[PDB]
C-alpha cells in the first residue's frame, strides 16, 4: 500500500498561511469553548487520533486518507467528544475548498500546539481524500486503563520507540477528559491551555491517590486538583520511562524539540514524499505576524 503526496494544484507556502491564520484567528475568537480553555486542546486530540489508526506493518490508516468525515470513524467510541473540532474546522473547510480532509485535520493540530505557545512543527502538505471503503476498522486506538507493557507495545505499531512516546505524552497536560467522552473526569479547577513541560512536574512531585470516578473507573487524583489516566501513571512506573520524565522536568528546551519531531512524525506516517516535493513549512504565528 503506498500513498505519495500530491501538493493541491497550484498551492504554495503563502496559501497554507493563509488556512492557519483562519483557524489560529477562530482559535482566539471561539474562547469560550469548554469553561473557557478554547478549542486548542481538542484540535491537537483529532490531529492525534486521525493518525494514530497507523499501521506500520500494511499502511492502513494514518493522516492520508482523512476518513475521518465516514461515519464509522466519526462513530468510533474512541473519538466520543471530537464532533466538536470537527464542527470548528467546517467553516474554515468551507472557505477553502481546496485544501484535502487530511491536512485540514493535521494543520489544525500544527496549529493549535503554536498558537497554544509550544514548538514550531514543520509540516507538510499533500495528503489526498480517499474513499469511504479505505476506512479504518473501530479499535485501534489505546485503552486508558493499562499500563507501561500495553503503552510500549501499543505505540510499537507506529513505530515510535520509548522516547518518542514520554514525549507524545507530555501533551496530557492540555485540556479534560469528560466523564460522559471517556468515562473519565477532571481536572478540576483550572485546566491548562498553555504548552509546557508541566505535566512531568506534576507527575513527579505531585502526592496522587488511586481513587473510583462516577464512571466507576479508576483514575490518580492530586490534592490539587490534577487528576492522570493508569496510562499516564504508566511513566513513572517503568524504570525507562521514568528516566526520560525526569530528563523533560528538568530540561523544558529538549521537551519542546522532542516533542515536534515525534509529532511530525505521528502526522506524516504511511505517506511516501517524491524527492521534487517541497521542503516541509513552518508557519508564523499571529503573534510574529503582528496579527
Ligand atoms: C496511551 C495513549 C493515550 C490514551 C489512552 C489517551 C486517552 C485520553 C483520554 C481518555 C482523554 C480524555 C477524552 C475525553 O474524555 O474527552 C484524552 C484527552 C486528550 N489527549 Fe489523549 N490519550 C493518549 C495519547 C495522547 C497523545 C499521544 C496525545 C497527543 C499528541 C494526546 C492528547 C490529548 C489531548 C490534548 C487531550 C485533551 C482533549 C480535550 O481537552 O478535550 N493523547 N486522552
Ligand atoms: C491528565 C490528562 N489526561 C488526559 C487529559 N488530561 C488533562
Known sequence: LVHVASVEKGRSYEDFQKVYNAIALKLREDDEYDNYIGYGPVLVRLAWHISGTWDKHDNTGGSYGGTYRFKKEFNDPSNAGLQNGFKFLEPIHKEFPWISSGDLFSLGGVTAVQEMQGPKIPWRCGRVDTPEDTTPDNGRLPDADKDAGYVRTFFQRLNMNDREVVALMGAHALGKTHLKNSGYEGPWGAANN??????????????????????????????????????????????????????????????????????????????????????????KTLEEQGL
Do not use: C, H, R
Not at 222 to 250: H, R
Open 194 to 283: 498553555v504548552f509546557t513541560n508541566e505535566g512531568y512536574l506534576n507527575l513527579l512531585n505531585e502526592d496522587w491517590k488511586l481513587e473510583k470516578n462516577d464512571a466507576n473507573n479508576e483514575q490518580w487524583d492530586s490534592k490539587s486538583g490534577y487528576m492522570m489516566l493508569p496510562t499516564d501513571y504508566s511513566l513513572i512506573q517503568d524504570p525507562k520511562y521514568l528516566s526520560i520524565v525526569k530528563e523533560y522536568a528538568n530540561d523544558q528546551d529538549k521537551f519542546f524539540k522532542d516533542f515536534s519531531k515525534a509529532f511530525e512524525k505521528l502526522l506524516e506516517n504511511g505517506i511516501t514524499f517524491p524527492k521534487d516535493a517541497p521542503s516541509p513549512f513552518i508557519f
